[PDB]
């Protein structure tokens, strides 16, 4: 169970989302715990992009779907706590924690993430997450390509 950090602001809290794009993005990252690439790909536009910085990016719906599906066969996303959400110039930001459990070891990892999203007509045109990948290699049972 994760605690509220000292620097958490109430003015930008998750429960205070107040634009459509923010409400879509908060819904999306909460759906992460479904662990289901079929459900999740429906949120994306055909011309789109997804990257865990600075690993090789995925461009286009097929590549995004394939990479999501590959993640969910080696790792479970158990929790996603969003501390901040906000938006500006057509972009949306989430300051959050994701909890990943390695399916072959059962070990659990807390990742502190700051993510940026771009939407066109309610659909995801880009999604980049920033975090420390030091434990990411051990946590995902897949060769890092970068
Ligand atoms: Na707000």
> Of 134, 133, 94, 132, which Cα lies nearest the Cα of 114?
94
CA–CA dist 143, 126 (Å, integer) = 24
Pairing of strands 123-130, 58-59: unpaired
Alpha carbon distance 59, 141 (integer Å): 22
Domains within the chain, CATH numbers bracketed = 1-146 (3.10.450.50)
The per-residue DSSP string of 21-76 comes to HHHHHHHHHHHGGG--HHHHHTTB-SS-EEEETTSPPEESHHHHHHHHHHHTTTEE
The residue from 30, 98, 132, 141 that is catalytic is 98
- What is the C-alpha separation between 82 and 140, in angstroms, rounded? 22
Catalytic residue status for 21:
no
Experimental method: X-ray
d(CA 127, CA 65): 13
Long-range Cβ pairs for the range 56-63 (8 Å, 24+): 56/145, 56/146
Half-sphere exposure of 118 (CA within 13 A, CB side): 10
Cα–Cα dist 48/40, whole Å: 14
Residues 6+ positions from 42 with CB-CB distance below 8 Å: none
Say how many CA atoms lie within 13 Å of 86 toward its Cβ: 10
Q: How far is the CA of 136 from the centre of ligand 1 (A)?
A: 31
Alpha-carbon distance of 94 to 127, in angstroms, equals 11
Taking ligand 1, which is a single-atom ion, which protein residues have CB atoms under 5 Å away? 16, 18
- Annotation marks residue 30 as catalytic: no
Q: Which of 11, 21, 62, 129 is catalytic?
A: 129
């Amino acid at each position: 169970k994760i605690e509220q950090p000292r620097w958490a602001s109430k003015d930008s809290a998750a429960g205070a989302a107040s634009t459509p794009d923010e409400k879509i993005v908060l819904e999306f990252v909460d759906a992460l715990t479904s662990n289901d690439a079929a459900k999740l790909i429906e949120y994306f536009a055909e011309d789109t992009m997804y990257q865990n910085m600075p690993l090789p990016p995925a461009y286009g719906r097929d590549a995004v779907e394939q990479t999501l599906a590959g993640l969910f066969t080696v790792v479970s996303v158990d929790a996603v706590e969003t501390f901040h959400i906000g938006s500006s110039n057509g972009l949306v930001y989430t300051e959050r924690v994701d909890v990943l459990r390695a399916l072959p070891t059962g070990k659990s990892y807390n990742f502190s993430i700051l993510g940026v999203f771009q939407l066109t007509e309610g659909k995801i045109t880009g999604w980049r997450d920033y975090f420390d990948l030091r434990e990411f290699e051990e946590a995902v049972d897949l060769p890092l390509r970068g």
